[PDB]
Ligand binder design. Structure first.
Ligand SMILES: Nc1nc2c(ncn2[C@@H]2O[C@H](COP(=O)(O)OP(=O)(O)NP(=O)(O)O)[C@@H](O)[C@H]2O)c(=O)[nH]1
Ligand SMILES: [Mg+2]
Lengths: 161, 235
């Protein structure tokens, strides 16, 4: 099952994947911008079976830097990531979602990272929850400094696929 | 004019089966001049690696189902040829850790000590190409693998502690893919040392180095690691 992880720069896309699969992510520390990469992870579904997921890490999206359109043409599922401290990161989750619908069933999980910076928040939980209900996707407010936040969204994605 | 046009279109087509795309991607590699392929690789790096990786993973599971056959080895040898062409034509992106993890794990599946000798030598050959492009931008681990490519040498020392090639490859609910031998063997330093030197000499003589010719920079980086870990214990 091919999964595309996409979001704005430094929202935590690679930290989520690496802290999920290895738990060795130290916050801050090594900072290298991602370009393209694939992680292999097996996820226990809710039944208890295991599905092998090809997690394609993406280069951070930016003003003038859009997602390649061929990801839409092969991705089985999407992990959309914003940072709750960055409103624009959430705004890009929305526009990516509208793309996903246009460019052709798929599984989408929206993650809200860096909630440990609650006092530094720029994405209200209520507005994010309401958008999740409106687009009929599942949205978790998670953080990389606490791995337990990450498990729930990914087991749900695996159960779909 | 149909062969290249028709084959190229299918390789670029995302809807087409990745297996079908590989068939025609290999066709391009055999009939297209190197300078032409380099520009093709530079333009379509993202999807070409997608074709390689999905097909490689595809073959891995096949080898673990049908077992090792003649036909499987044909396919495997083809995938690595594409793999090599990726390592040759995209050093600048590889240098920037483009598919750092997927390439790393893929090489670890060849370098696993349970593999047949042929595959293990193939892993060494491709690893050195990866490191020559990765150069200084490599992480610590790649150095330790380089210092452990040859069994029997004094156990390497890392930041966490002592390590071996087998420790570097294979240290409740969700777990990452565990590396397993691609072609398990079926029922020594003289040897793998010769392999390491034999391949490093070939890389020195290797032609068609990128116009930036940062291959020279990487090879000397490769040499310093060789000077640090293997040369001291050589007569
Ligand atoms: N405090 C805190 N920092 C976090 C959290 N998640 C990620 N970070 C930090 O945010 C930075 C960016 O993380 P990284 O995974 O490299 O982001 P990316 O989105 O993969 N980068 P790009 O989009 O440029 O490829 C790192 O310094 C990381 O430690 C989190 O939950 N809390
Ligand atoms: Mg990244």
């Amino acid at each position: 099952c091919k999964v595309v992880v996409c979001g704005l720069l430094s929202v935590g896309k690679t930290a989520i994947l690496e802290q999920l699969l290895y738990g060795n992510h130290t916050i801050g520390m090594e900072d290298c911008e991602t370009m393209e990469d694939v992680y292999m992870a097996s996820v226990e579904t809710d039944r208890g079976v295991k599905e092998q997921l090809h997690l394609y890490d993406t280069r951070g999206l930016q003003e003038g830097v859009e997602l390649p359109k061929h990801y839409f043409s092969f991705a089985d599922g999407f992990v959309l990531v914003y940072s709750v401290n960055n409103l624009e990161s959430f705004q890009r989750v929305e526009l990516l979602k509208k793309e996903i619908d246009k460019f052709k069933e798929v599984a989408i999980v929206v993650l809200g990272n860096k909630i440990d910076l609650s006092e530094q928040r720029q994405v209200d939980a209520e507005v994010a929850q309401q958008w999740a209900k409106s687009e009929k996707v599942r949205l978790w407010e998670v953080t990389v400094t606490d791995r337990k936040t990450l498990i729930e969204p990914f087991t749900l994605l695996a159960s779909k696929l | 004019h149909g062969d290249v046009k028709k084959s190229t279109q299918k390789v670029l087509d995302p809807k087409k089966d990745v297996l079908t795309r590989l068939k025609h991607l290999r066709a391009l590699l055999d009939n297209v001049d190197a300078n032409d392929l380099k520009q093709f690789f530079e333009t379509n790096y993202s999807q070409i690696y997608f074709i390689f990786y999905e097909n490689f993973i595809a073959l891995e599971n096949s080898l673990k189902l049908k077992g090792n056959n003649k036909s499987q080895r044909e396919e495997l040898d083809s995938i690595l040829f594409l793999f090599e062409k990726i390592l040759q034509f995209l050093p600048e992106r590889i240098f920037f850790r483009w598919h750092y993890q997927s390439i790393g794990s893929t090489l670890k599946k060849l370098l696993h000590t349970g593999n047949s000798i042929k595959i293990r030598c193939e892993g060494i050959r491709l690893f050195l190409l990866w490191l020559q492009a990765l150069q200084t931008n490599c992480a610590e681990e790649q150095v330790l693998i380089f210092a452990c490519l040859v069994p029997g040498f004094p156990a390497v020392m890392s930041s966490r502690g002592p390590c071996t090639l087998e420790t570097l490859i294979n240290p409740v609910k969700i777990y990452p893919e565990e590396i397993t031998p691609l072609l398990p063997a079926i029922s020594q330093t003289c040897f793998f040392l010769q392999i390491l030197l034999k391949y490093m000499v070939i890389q020195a003589a290797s032609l068609e180095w990128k116009n930036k010719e940062n291959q020279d920079t990487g090879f000397k980086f490769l040499f310093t690691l060789f000077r640090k870990y293997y040369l001291p214990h050589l007569f």
